[PDB]
Design a protein around this ligand. Sequence first.
Ligand SMILES: NC(=O)c1ccc[n+]([C@@H]2O[C@H](COP(=O)([O-])OP(=O)(O)OC[C@H]3O[C@@H](n4cnc5c(N)ncnc54)[C@H](OP(=O)(O)O)[C@@H]3O)[C@@H](O)[C@H]2O)c1
Ligand SMILES: O=C(O)Cc1nn(Cc2nc3cc(C(F)(F)F)ccc3s2)c(=O)c2ccccc12
Length: 314
Amino acid sequence: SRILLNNGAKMPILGLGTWKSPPGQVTEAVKVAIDVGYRHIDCAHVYQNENEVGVAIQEKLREQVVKREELFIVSKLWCTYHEKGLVKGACQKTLSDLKLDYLDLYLIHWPTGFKPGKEFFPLDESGNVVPSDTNILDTWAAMEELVDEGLVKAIGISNFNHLQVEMILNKPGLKYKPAVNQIECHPYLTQEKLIQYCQSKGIVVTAYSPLGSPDRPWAKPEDPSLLEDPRIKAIAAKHNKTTAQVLIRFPMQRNLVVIPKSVTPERIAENFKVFDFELSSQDMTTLLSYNRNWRVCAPLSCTSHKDYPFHEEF
Ligand SMILES: NC(=O)c1ccc[n+]([C@@H]2O[C@H](COP(=O)([O-])OP(=O)(O)OC[C@H]3O[C@@H](n4cnc5c(N)ncnc54)[C@H](OP(=O)(O)O)[C@@H]3O)[C@@H](O)[C@H]2O)c1
Ligand SMILES: O=C(O)Cc1nn(Cc2nc3cc(C(F)(F)F)ccc3s2)c(=O)c2ccccc12
Protein backbone atom coordinates (compact mmCIF):
# COMPACT_ATOMS: atom_id res chain seq x y z
CA SER A 1 0.00 0.00 0.00
CA ARG A 2 3.00 2.39 0.29
CA ILE A 3 5.98 3.34 -1.89
CA LEU A 4 9.42 4.23 -0.53
CA LEU A 5 10.58 7.81 -1.07
CA ASN A 6 14.16 8.96 -1.34
CA ASN A 7 13.91 10.64 2.11
CA GLY A 8 13.25 7.32 3.79
CA ALA A 9 9.49 7.79 4.18
CA LYS A 10 6.69 5.69 2.76
CA MET A 11 3.93 7.30 0.72
CA PRO A 12 0.47 5.71 0.32
CA ILE A 13 -0.03 4.82 -3.30
CA LEU A 14 -3.73 5.73 -3.19
CA GLY A 15 -4.69 9.24 -2.06
CA LEU A 16 -7.68 11.59 -2.04
CA GLY A 17 -7.68 14.51 -4.46
CA THR A 18 -9.33 17.74 -3.33
CA TRP A 19 -9.30 20.08 -6.35
CA LYS A 20 -12.89 21.31 -7.03
CA SER A 21 -14.08 19.90 -3.71
CA PRO A 22 -16.24 22.67 -2.28
CA PRO A 23 -15.70 23.72 1.35
CA GLY A 24 -19.40 22.85 1.43
CA GLN A 25 -18.54 19.12 1.05
CA VAL A 26 -14.78 18.61 1.49
CA THR A 27 -14.83 18.26 5.27
CA GLU A 28 -17.27 15.37 4.92
CA ALA A 29 -15.28 13.82 2.07
CA VAL A 30 -12.06 13.77 4.06
CA LYS A 31 -13.77 12.41 7.16
CA VAL A 32 -15.24 9.56 5.15
CA ALA A 33 -12.03 8.93 3.21
CA ILE A 34 -10.23 8.54 6.54
CA ASP A 35 -13.01 6.25 7.85
CA VAL A 36 -12.68 3.89 4.89
CA GLY A 37 -8.86 3.85 4.91
CA TYR A 38 -7.33 6.69 2.97
CA ARG A 39 -4.18 8.01 4.60
CA HIS A 40 -2.94 10.33 1.83
CA ILE A 41 -4.72 13.55 0.96
CA ASP A 42 -3.58 15.73 -1.91
CA CYS A 43 -4.11 19.44 -1.23
CA ALA A 44 -3.19 22.88 -2.57
CA HIS A 45 -3.52 26.52 -1.45
CA VAL A 46 -4.98 27.28 -4.90
CA TYR A 47 -7.83 24.82 -4.21
CA GLN A 48 -9.23 27.32 -1.66
CA ASN A 49 -10.39 24.56 0.74
CA GLU A 50 -7.33 23.71 2.92
CA ASN A 51 -9.04 25.10 6.06
CA GLU A 52 -11.89 22.64 5.61
CA VAL A 53 -9.52 19.74 4.89
CA GLY A 54 -7.74 20.76 8.13
CA VAL A 55 -11.06 20.63 9.98
CA ALA A 56 -11.64 17.04 8.95
CA ILE A 57 -8.13 15.86 9.82
CA GLN A 58 -8.23 17.53 13.21
CA GLU A 59 -11.54 15.98 14.07
CA LYS A 60 -10.51 12.47 13.11
CA LEU A 61 -7.23 12.84 15.19
CA ARG A 62 -9.37 13.87 18.13
CA GLU A 63 -11.89 11.03 17.55
CA GLN A 64 -8.79 8.77 17.72
CA VAL A 65 -9.42 7.23 14.31
CA VAL A 66 -5.96 7.96 13.04
CA LYS A 67 -2.70 9.44 14.39
CA ARG A 68 -0.71 12.07 12.53
CA GLU A 69 2.21 9.78 11.77
CA GLU A 70 -0.11 7.51 9.76
CA LEU A 71 -1.33 10.40 7.59
CA PHE A 72 0.57 11.56 4.48
CA ILE A 73 -0.45 15.17 3.75
CA VAL A 74 0.67 16.83 0.50
CA SER A 75 0.33 20.48 -0.49
CA LYS A 76 1.74 22.66 -3.25
CA LEU A 77 3.34 26.10 -3.62
CA TRP A 78 1.16 28.11 -6.02
CA CYS A 79 2.69 30.01 -8.95
CA THR A 80 2.37 33.48 -7.45
CA TYR A 81 4.73 32.58 -4.58
CA HIS A 82 7.85 31.40 -6.44
CA GLU A 83 9.97 34.27 -5.22
CA LYS A 84 12.37 32.97 -2.60
CA GLY A 85 11.13 35.54 -0.03
CA LEU A 86 7.50 34.33 -0.43
CA VAL A 87 7.98 30.55 -0.18
CA LYS A 88 8.09 30.05 3.61
CA GLY A 89 5.10 32.28 4.11
CA ALA A 90 3.11 30.37 1.54
CA CYS A 91 4.00 27.05 3.19
CA GLN A 92 3.13 28.35 6.63
CA LYS A 93 -0.26 29.61 5.39
CA THR A 94 -0.94 26.10 4.17
CA LEU A 95 0.25 24.65 7.47
CA SER A 96 -1.96 27.00 9.45
CA ASP A 97 -5.02 26.36 7.31
CA LEU A 98 -4.48 22.58 7.53
CA LYS A 99 -3.88 22.95 11.32
CA LEU A 100 -0.66 20.95 10.94
CA ASP A 101 2.91 21.53 12.11
CA TYR A 102 4.44 19.71 9.12
CA LEU A 103 3.62 18.47 5.64
CA ASP A 104 4.77 15.06 4.47
CA LEU A 105 5.34 16.43 0.96
CA TYR A 106 5.38 19.95 -0.49
CA LEU A 107 5.50 20.43 -4.23
CA ILE A 108 6.30 23.22 -6.61
CA HIS A 109 2.88 23.23 -8.10
CA TRP A 110 3.80 24.36 -11.63
CA PRO A 111 7.29 25.23 -12.99
CA THR A 112 5.98 28.64 -14.04
CA GLY A 113 6.13 31.69 -11.75
CA PHE A 114 3.28 34.19 -12.04
CA LYS A 115 3.25 37.83 -10.94
CA PRO A 116 2.98 38.02 -7.18
CA GLY A 117 -0.25 39.45 -5.94
CA LYS A 118 -3.64 38.60 -4.53
CA GLU A 119 -4.86 37.12 -7.85
CA PHE A 120 -4.03 33.45 -8.44
CA PHE A 121 -4.18 33.88 -12.22
CA PRO A 122 -2.97 37.38 -13.07
CA LEU A 123 -3.89 38.19 -16.64
CA ASP A 124 -3.08 41.35 -18.55
CA GLU A 125 -5.54 43.59 -20.43
CA SER A 126 -5.60 40.93 -23.14
CA GLY A 127 -5.76 37.62 -21.21
CA ASN A 128 -2.13 36.50 -21.22
CA VAL A 129 -0.82 35.18 -17.91
CA VAL A 130 1.55 37.72 -16.34
CA PRO A 131 4.72 35.81 -15.42
CA SER A 132 7.14 36.62 -12.64
CA ASP A 133 10.86 36.73 -13.05
CA THR A 134 11.62 33.75 -11.02
CA ASN A 135 13.48 30.65 -12.09
CA ILE A 136 13.16 26.98 -11.12
CA LEU A 137 16.49 26.72 -9.35
CA ASP A 138 15.99 29.66 -6.96
CA THR A 139 12.52 28.37 -6.17
CA TRP A 140 13.92 24.89 -5.54
CA ALA A 141 16.52 26.29 -3.14
CA ALA A 142 13.72 27.96 -1.24
CA MET A 143 11.86 24.64 -1.05
CA GLU A 144 15.03 23.08 0.38
CA GLU A 145 15.08 25.58 3.25
CA LEU A 146 11.67 24.26 4.29
CA VAL A 147 13.04 20.76 4.81
CA ASP A 148 15.96 22.14 6.72
CA GLU A 149 13.58 24.06 9.03
CA GLY A 150 11.40 21.05 9.72
CA LEU A 151 8.30 22.42 8.09
CA VAL A 152 8.09 19.68 5.43
CA LYS A 153 9.54 16.16 5.37
CA ALA A 154 10.03 15.92 1.61
CA ILE A 155 9.88 18.24 -1.35
CA GLY A 156 9.05 17.57 -4.95
CA ILE A 157 7.72 19.03 -8.21
CA SER A 158 4.57 18.87 -10.32
CA ASN A 159 4.12 19.39 -14.05
CA PHE A 160 7.86 19.49 -14.71
CA ASN A 161 9.12 18.11 -18.01
CA HIS A 162 12.22 15.88 -17.93
CA LEU A 163 14.59 18.76 -18.78
CA GLN A 164 13.14 20.83 -15.93
CA VAL A 165 13.67 17.90 -13.58
CA GLU A 166 17.20 17.50 -14.99
CA MET A 167 17.91 21.20 -14.16
CA ILE A 168 17.22 20.45 -10.52
CA LEU A 169 19.15 17.19 -10.44
CA ASN A 170 22.18 18.87 -11.97
CA LYS A 171 22.05 21.95 -9.67
CA PRO A 172 25.54 22.60 -8.27
CA GLY A 173 25.21 22.43 -4.50
CA LEU A 174 21.84 20.64 -4.51
CA LYS A 175 20.67 19.75 -0.97
CA TYR A 176 17.67 17.51 -1.68
CA LYS A 177 16.65 15.64 -4.80
CA PRO A 178 12.96 15.89 -5.63
CA ALA A 179 11.08 12.96 -4.20
CA VAL A 180 8.00 13.11 -6.36
CA ASN A 181 6.96 14.48 -9.71
CA GLN A 182 3.14 14.81 -9.83
CA ILE A 183 1.88 14.79 -13.40
CA GLU A 184 -1.32 14.25 -15.35
CA CYS A 185 -1.59 10.60 -16.21
CA HIS A 186 -4.34 8.33 -17.53
CA PRO A 187 -5.07 6.05 -20.54
CA TYR A 188 -5.37 9.06 -22.96
CA LEU A 189 -2.07 10.53 -21.60
CA THR A 190 0.08 7.61 -20.59
CA GLN A 191 3.39 9.52 -20.04
CA GLU A 192 5.60 6.54 -20.88
CA LYS A 193 8.82 8.58 -21.52
CA LEU A 194 8.48 10.96 -18.58
CA ILE A 195 7.67 8.09 -16.21
CA GLN A 196 10.59 6.06 -17.46
CA TYR A 197 12.80 9.09 -16.91
CA CYS A 198 11.58 9.82 -13.41
CA GLN A 199 11.66 6.23 -12.17
CA SER A 200 15.20 5.87 -13.58
CA LYS A 201 16.18 8.74 -11.28
CA GLY A 202 14.44 7.33 -8.17
CA ILE A 203 11.72 9.98 -8.37
CA VAL A 204 8.24 8.63 -7.59
CA VAL A 205 5.50 9.69 -9.95
CA THR A 206 2.00 10.62 -8.82
CA ALA A 207 -0.75 10.43 -11.42
CA TYR A 208 -3.33 13.23 -11.23
CA SER A 209 -6.70 13.43 -13.03
CA PRO A 210 -6.71 9.60 -13.29
CA LEU A 211 -10.42 9.58 -14.17
CA GLY A 212 -10.12 12.27 -16.79
CA SER A 213 -11.26 15.15 -14.58
CA PRO A 214 -14.83 15.23 -15.88
CA ASP A 215 -15.53 18.19 -13.54
CA ARG A 216 -12.74 20.36 -14.95
CA PRO A 217 -14.33 23.78 -15.52
CA TRP A 218 -13.18 24.19 -19.18
CA ALA A 219 -14.55 20.85 -20.39
CA LYS A 220 -16.02 20.71 -23.87
CA PRO A 221 -18.76 18.23 -24.64
CA GLU A 222 -16.84 16.85 -27.62
CA ASP A 223 -13.78 16.05 -25.54
CA PRO A 224 -12.95 12.40 -24.92
CA SER A 225 -14.47 11.04 -21.72
CA LEU A 226 -12.50 8.26 -19.96
CA LEU A 227 -15.20 7.26 -17.57
CA GLU A 228 -17.69 6.77 -20.48
CA ASP A 229 -15.28 5.06 -22.85
CA PRO A 230 -17.02 1.78 -23.70
CA ARG A 231 -13.68 0.04 -24.26
CA ILE A 232 -12.72 0.71 -20.66
CA LYS A 233 -16.23 -0.18 -19.44
CA ALA A 234 -15.71 -3.56 -21.06
CA ILE A 235 -12.46 -4.14 -19.15
CA ALA A 236 -14.27 -3.10 -15.97
CA ALA A 237 -17.21 -5.42 -16.52
CA LYS A 238 -14.96 -8.41 -17.12
CA HIS A 239 -13.46 -7.85 -13.63
CA ASN A 240 -16.75 -7.01 -11.97
CA LYS A 241 -15.45 -3.55 -11.08
CA THR A 242 -16.41 0.00 -12.06
CA THR A 243 -14.55 1.97 -14.73
CA ALA A 244 -13.26 4.34 -12.02
CA GLN A 245 -11.80 1.26 -10.26
CA VAL A 246 -10.08 0.14 -13.44
CA LEU A 247 -8.78 3.67 -14.04
CA ILE A 248 -7.40 3.81 -10.46
CA ARG A 249 -5.88 0.33 -10.47
CA PHE A 250 -4.11 1.09 -13.82
CA PRO A 251 -1.47 3.55 -12.48
CA MET A 252 -1.06 1.38 -9.36
CA GLN A 253 0.32 -1.44 -11.54
CA ARG A 254 2.77 0.96 -13.17
CA ASN A 255 4.30 1.64 -9.73
CA LEU A 256 2.61 5.04 -9.61
CA VAL A 257 0.81 6.87 -6.85
CA VAL A 258 -2.72 7.91 -7.79
CA ILE A 259 -5.01 10.54 -6.33
CA PRO A 260 -8.64 10.30 -7.50
CA LYS A 261 -10.95 13.06 -6.38
CA SER A 262 -14.48 12.70 -5.07
CA VAL A 263 -16.81 14.40 -2.62
CA THR A 264 -19.47 11.69 -2.98
CA PRO A 265 -19.24 9.25 0.05
CA GLU A 266 -20.22 6.23 -2.02
CA ARG A 267 -17.57 6.98 -4.64
CA ILE A 268 -14.94 7.74 -1.97
CA ALA A 269 -15.48 4.18 -0.66
CA GLU A 270 -15.73 2.61 -4.16
CA ASN A 271 -12.50 4.21 -5.33
CA PHE A 272 -10.57 2.75 -2.41
CA LYS A 273 -11.72 -0.79 -3.20
CA VAL A 274 -8.93 -1.52 -5.66
CA PHE A 275 -6.59 -3.78 -3.68
CA ASP A 276 -8.76 -6.88 -4.26
CA PHE A 277 -8.14 -7.37 -7.97
CA GLU A 278 -5.56 -7.23 -10.73
CA LEU A 279 -5.56 -6.01 -14.30
CA SER A 280 -4.00 -8.53 -16.63
CA SER A 281 -1.09 -8.09 -18.99
CA GLN A 282 -3.48 -7.63 -21.90
CA ASP A 283 -5.60 -5.11 -19.90
CA MET A 284 -2.51 -3.00 -19.17
CA THR A 285 -1.33 -3.22 -22.77
CA THR A 286 -4.82 -2.34 -23.96
CA LEU A 287 -5.14 0.66 -21.68
CA LEU A 288 -1.69 2.00 -22.67
CA SER A 289 -2.73 1.72 -26.33
CA TYR A 290 -5.39 4.37 -25.76
CA ASN A 291 -2.84 7.13 -25.43
CA ARG A 292 -3.65 10.23 -27.46
CA ASN A 293 -1.47 12.86 -25.71
CA TRP A 294 -4.63 14.61 -24.43
CA ARG A 295 -4.30 16.88 -21.42
CA VAL A 296 -6.86 18.17 -18.92
CA CYS A 297 -4.40 20.74 -17.73
CA ALA A 298 -2.72 22.72 -20.47
CA PRO A 299 -4.12 26.24 -20.90
CA LEU A 300 -3.45 28.37 -23.95
CA SER A 301 -3.03 31.32 -21.58
CA CYS A 302 0.30 29.98 -20.29
CA THR A 303 1.95 28.75 -23.53
CA SER A 304 4.22 31.76 -23.92
CA HIS A 305 5.81 31.42 -20.47
CA LYS A 306 9.59 30.76 -20.59
CA ASP A 307 9.17 27.80 -18.27
CA TYR A 308 5.98 26.40 -19.98
CA PRO A 309 6.49 22.67 -19.54
CA PHE A 310 4.62 21.13 -22.47
CA HIS A 311 6.52 22.33 -25.53
CA GLU A 312 9.04 19.49 -24.98
CA GLU A 313 8.21 15.97 -26.05
CA PHE A 314 8.38 14.88 -22.44
N1 LIG B 1 -0.62 19.03 -9.57
C1 LIG B 1 -1.52 19.58 -10.35
O1 LIG B 1 -1.32 20.42 -11.22
C2 LIG B 1 -2.90 18.88 -10.36
C3 LIG B 1 -3.81 19.09 -11.45
C4 LIG B 1 -5.09 18.45 -11.47
C5 LIG B 1 -5.41 17.61 -10.39
N2 LIG B 1 -4.45 17.45 -9.32
C6 LIG B 1 -4.86 16.61 -8.11
O2 LIG B 1 -5.40 15.39 -8.66
C7 LIG B 1 -6.76 15.08 -8.16
C8 LIG B 1 -7.58 14.26 -9.12
O3 LIG B 1 -7.70 14.96 -10.39
P1 LIG B 1 -9.06 15.73 -10.78
O4 LIG B 1 -9.70 16.34 -9.59
O5 LIG B 1 -8.63 16.63 -11.88
O6 LIG B 1 -10.03 14.63 -11.43
P2 LIG B 1 -10.29 13.05 -11.33
O7 LIG B 1 -9.90 12.52 -10.03
O8 LIG B 1 -9.82 12.42 -12.57
O9 LIG B 1 -11.90 13.04 -11.53
C9 LIG B 1 -12.73 13.57 -10.50
C10 LIG B 1 -14.17 13.59 -11.11
O10 LIG B 1 -14.60 12.27 -11.16
C11 LIG B 1 -15.76 12.03 -10.40
N3 LIG B 1 -15.66 10.73 -9.80
C12 LIG B 1 -14.86 10.30 -8.75
N4 LIG B 1 -15.01 9.03 -8.44
C13 LIG B 1 -15.96 8.60 -9.35
C14 LIG B 1 -16.50 7.30 -9.47
N5 LIG B 1 -16.18 6.25 -8.72
N6 LIG B 1 -17.45 7.16 -10.50
C15 LIG B 1 -17.82 8.22 -11.31
N7 LIG B 1 -17.29 9.48 -11.18
C16 LIG B 1 -16.34 9.64 -10.16
C17 LIG B 1 -15.81 13.13 -9.38
O11 LIG B 1 -17.14 13.45 -8.99
P3 LIG B 1 -17.65 13.81 -7.51
O12 LIG B 1 -16.51 14.44 -6.76
O13 LIG B 1 -18.86 14.75 -7.67
O14 LIG B 1 -18.05 12.47 -6.83
C18 LIG B 1 -15.20 14.31 -10.18
O15 LIG B 1 -16.15 14.95 -11.05
C19 LIG B 1 -7.25 16.54 -7.87
O16 LIG B 1 -8.43 16.67 -7.11
C20 LIG B 1 -5.99 17.17 -7.30
O17 LIG B 1 -5.86 16.80 -5.91
C21 LIG B 1 -3.20 18.06 -9.26
O1 LIG C 1 -3.34 23.31 -10.60
C1 LIG C 1 -4.16 22.38 -10.34
O2 LIG C 1 -3.86 21.59 -9.41
C2 LIG C 1 -5.45 22.24 -11.08
C3 LIG C 1 -5.83 23.52 -11.83
N1 LIG C 1 -5.51 23.50 -13.07
N2 LIG C 1 -5.81 24.60 -13.83
C4 LIG C 1 -5.39 24.43 -15.23
C5 LIG C 1 -3.90 25.02 -15.15
N3 LIG C 1 -2.98 24.85 -16.05
C6 LIG C 1 -1.74 25.46 -15.78
C7 LIG C 1 -0.59 25.43 -16.60
C8 LIG C 1 0.55 26.10 -16.16
C9 LIG C 1 1.77 26.06 -17.04
F1 LIG C 1 2.87 25.65 -16.35
F2 LIG C 1 1.73 25.05 -17.90
F3 LIG C 1 2.03 27.15 -17.64
C10 LIG C 1 0.59 26.78 -14.97
C11 LIG C 1 -0.50 26.85 -14.15
C12 LIG C 1 -1.67 26.17 -14.57
S1 LIG C 1 -3.22 26.01 -13.84
C13 LIG C 1 -6.44 25.74 -13.37
O3 LIG C 1 -6.67 26.69 -14.11
C14 LIG C 1 -6.77 25.73 -11.98
C15 LIG C 1 -7.41 26.85 -11.43
C16 LIG C 1 -7.74 26.83 -10.08
C17 LIG C 1 -7.43 25.72 -9.27
C18 LIG C 1 -6.82 24.62 -9.80
C19 LIG C 1 -6.48 24.62 -11.18
